[PDB]
Amino acid sequence: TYLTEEKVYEILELCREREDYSPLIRVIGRVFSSAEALVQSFRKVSVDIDAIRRVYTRLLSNEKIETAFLNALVYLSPNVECDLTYHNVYSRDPNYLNLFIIVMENRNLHSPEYLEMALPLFCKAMSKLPLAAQGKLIRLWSKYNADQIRRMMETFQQLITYKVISNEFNSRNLVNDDDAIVAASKCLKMVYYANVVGGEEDDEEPIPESSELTLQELLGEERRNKKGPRVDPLETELCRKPLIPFEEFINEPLNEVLEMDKDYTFFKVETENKFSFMTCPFILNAVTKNLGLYYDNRIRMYSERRITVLYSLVQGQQLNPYLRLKVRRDHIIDDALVRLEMIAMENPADLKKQLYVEFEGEQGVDEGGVSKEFFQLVVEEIFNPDIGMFTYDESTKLFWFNPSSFETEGQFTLIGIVLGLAIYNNCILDVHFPMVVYRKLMGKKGTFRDLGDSHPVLYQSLKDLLEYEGNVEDDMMITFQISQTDLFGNPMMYDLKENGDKIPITNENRKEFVNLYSDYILNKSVEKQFKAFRRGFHMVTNESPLKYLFRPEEIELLICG
Amino acid sequence: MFQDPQERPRKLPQLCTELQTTIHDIILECVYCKQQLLRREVYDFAFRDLCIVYRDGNPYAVCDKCLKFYSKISEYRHYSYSLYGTTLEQQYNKPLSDLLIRCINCQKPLSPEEKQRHLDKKQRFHNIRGRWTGRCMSCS
Amino acid sequence: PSQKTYQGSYGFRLGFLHSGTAKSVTCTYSPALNKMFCQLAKTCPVQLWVDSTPPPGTRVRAMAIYKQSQHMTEVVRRCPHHELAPPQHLIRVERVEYLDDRNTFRHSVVVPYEPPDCTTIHYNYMCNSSCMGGMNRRPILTIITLEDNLLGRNSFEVRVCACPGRDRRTEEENLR
Ligand SMILES: [Zn+2]
Ligand SMILES: [Zn+2]
Ligand SMILES: [Zn+2]
């Protein structure tokens, strides 16, 4: 039975000529209940998804046909679930994915009729798909429009919501051993990556180690080590803007029945029949992601405490279990920079302890408030105009680096370390940084499209130059050598080309002129300052899953609150 | 003696043959505690496939105590996640006999009977500092 | 017959698969003995690691000599019993070139180097380490030279015996 358009139509008018649709019901029941037939069915003249949509349009108006579809999907699903696992077919048949892109066109998947037993079974059968098949399917889905991605999103959001509402989840019955929610979210991962795909880079350098480096010399792992629990369905395909906003995947009914105390366990030690809902972190709320990061960064503190206990045991050494600063209140930068420099030199992995920062001249037990006080003191004194490190756009109330700040490289490293320690041990600050800062931290340079946050008064001028329909060569005569004036009154004419002051702008050169001017404004003017800033930020949170759990858009929420 | 950067013997038997000696007639200094190593310690350093560490042109071994101690320190400090043997096989697209998995306390590479003992007993291989480690039967 | 280890400008070194001391294993490696035990006409996995990628045209050359001082002066000839493989080249690799010296007549198995985390070359040995007329229980050193002219060298003793399981354990326990 090689179904096509013509077989379905011929059976359809044969049914309506006898005024009874029993042949269509029996055909649809016996063909859509077999995995072998749909793989060879509906092939192009290797599958005509538009023609499947046409068949569904011309067919799904009858209730008997659609309930036959439901029961046939119920029959189809478990014999494919126990086929990808106990056997393997996609390796010997690339056509097998046809099965999963003919039943997905069913508009009644996004309906309560398929919610109870059809869709859980189908998403369980699809959850065990091999990684290459998942990559091909995500690549296929990425070309779909926004409404179809929203439909595939809500198809599994409905199932997760229904299976969370309908199932009572105490601490003894978790969401990790409920295969319906696990399969639905592991199939929603495909829709999330299809949204990512269908919707400029930094130069990272890591930090060394003192004693473990000699061990790395011993084992021979000295060239370059690897780091990151990064997902399996990546490096099969490709940071960018999505087709549907990333907040839409945040499943709120699931996020209030999770247990990150137990979920972090299955994230750091991989139990077989227990899914860890940070492998799919896009369904994690802000409080849930922050909770998981908090558990990770407290387990690291306990590991460093145990390391110092061992050093107390064998060698007899006495080591401080905290990052015990001692800053005089009259000089916070001058007395925190030197301590952080000393600790960064002698023991680079000592900044991954609990921060204890007490002031001289006063005795305080650090229950958390004293570290907080140190933090607003730092944010006050770093961001003041007297130190001359950050300028303050009052039209947007945003703090952006100074292109004319020199010999403060250590202090930019200090504020980077302040943000790193802030994220590390659960501290919230008041930093008014543009989002280009929170992306340039993660490893992505800033594009002209994000000059609207940092410098809006100049971004508007650049955009008005971009779509200016008249000839730009004879109207403003702006050269490639830009005209920027320092706060000192001196000009700081910067060069974007070898003959910038001799090459006039043209109606074609403006497109790259804008994207070199933006590059100079927010990548090259502040290159030393941000290099120091990002090194300071990285040296505290280099072993953290923050690049894995937290998107750049949801890190301003982590520091600023 | 071996102050040349790109001329020096990396492991113990190469060090023995370029020093006109044997593995039975060598005295070696631990790179951590700067103490001499006994016969069983240079034998274990040979069996564990550990590189000779060169400081100021002098070749250095590691005794048992410093090896186990700093391996434990690095286990605490740089642990990433524990994966199953079957998960490792399906992830790396290679059998466990084609992957380098060292012991987690003594850094002896695992013979395939030890990896099969991990697979049969449903134990996990731990990622420490980007390298996979298990547990040999000597340390289990 | 220069067996001296040379990491080279690119950090050339040799790795091997710790294939255990099984009764049924065909090839095994011992780092203490630095010996690659093997079975006649079976797989020999030798991994090549470099710190930096050499320029293309890099020649991984395998040359077998004798380990003993008095025996380095004459070449490892193929066993007269076996004289698709040529009857003169001992080490086999499973496009590959083969060279013989013009004065001392040494068989060098030359393969163009290919980047991958380790270039795993499969070698094969065709006579036993107890053949008559050839080795006659003479230990052999296989030298793997990453040379384009040298950019790196390493070496390892080789035994080709009846079973690489019993003799590896026996030799390691005679060492200890
Ligand atoms: Zn020692
Ligand atoms: Zn061990
Ligand atoms: Zn022979």
Residue numbers in the entry:
A (entry chain R): 126 to 170, 233 to 386, 394 to 432, 439 to 761
B (entry chain A): 8 to 147
C (entry chain B): 98 to 180, 188 to 198, 202 to 223, 228 to 259, 263 to 290
Q: Can you list sentences taken from the study reporting this PDB entry?
A:
Human papillomavirus (HPV) is a significant contributor to the global cancer burden, and its carcinogenic activity is facilitated in part by the HPV early protein 6 (E6), which interacts with the E3-ligase E6AP, also known as UBE3A, to promote degradation of the tumor suppressor, p53. Recruitment of E6AP by 16E6 forms a neo-destruction complex that promotes p53 degradation through E6AP-mediated polyubiquitination, leading to uncontrolled cell proliferation and tumorigenesis. The E6AP LXXLL peptide occupies and stabilizes the N- and C-terminal 16E6 lobes through binding at a hydrophobic groove via interactions dominated by the E6AP leucine triad in L(409)XXLL(413)24,29.
In this work, we advance the understanding of this complex by solving the cryoEM structure of the full-length 16E6, E6AP, and the p53core domain at ~3.3 Å resolution. To aid in structural studies, we adjusted the linker between MBP and 16E6 to be more rigid than the one used in SPR experiments. We modeled the 16E6, E6AP, and p53core structures into the electron density, revealing a ‘Y’-like conformation, with E6AP and p53core flanking HPV16 E6 with the individual 16E6 and p53 proteins superimposing well onto previous structures. The interaction interface between 16E6 and E6AP is significantly larger in the ternary complex compared to the 939 Å2 LXXLL peptide interface which expanded to approximately 2,361 Å2, or ~2.5-times larger, contributing approximately −13.23 kcal/mol binding energy. Although 16E6 and E6AP form a contiguous interface, we divided the interaction interface into three segments, labeled site 1, site 2, and site 3. Site 1 is composed of E6AP residues, E403 to D426, including the reported E6AP LXXLL motif (residues E406–E415); however, in our structure, the LXXLL motif is protracted to encompass E395 and E431 which extends from, and is perpendicular to, the 16E6 hydrophobic groove. The site 2 interface is formed between the α-helical linker between the N- and C-terminal 16E6 lobes and the E6AP α-helix between residues S503–Q515.
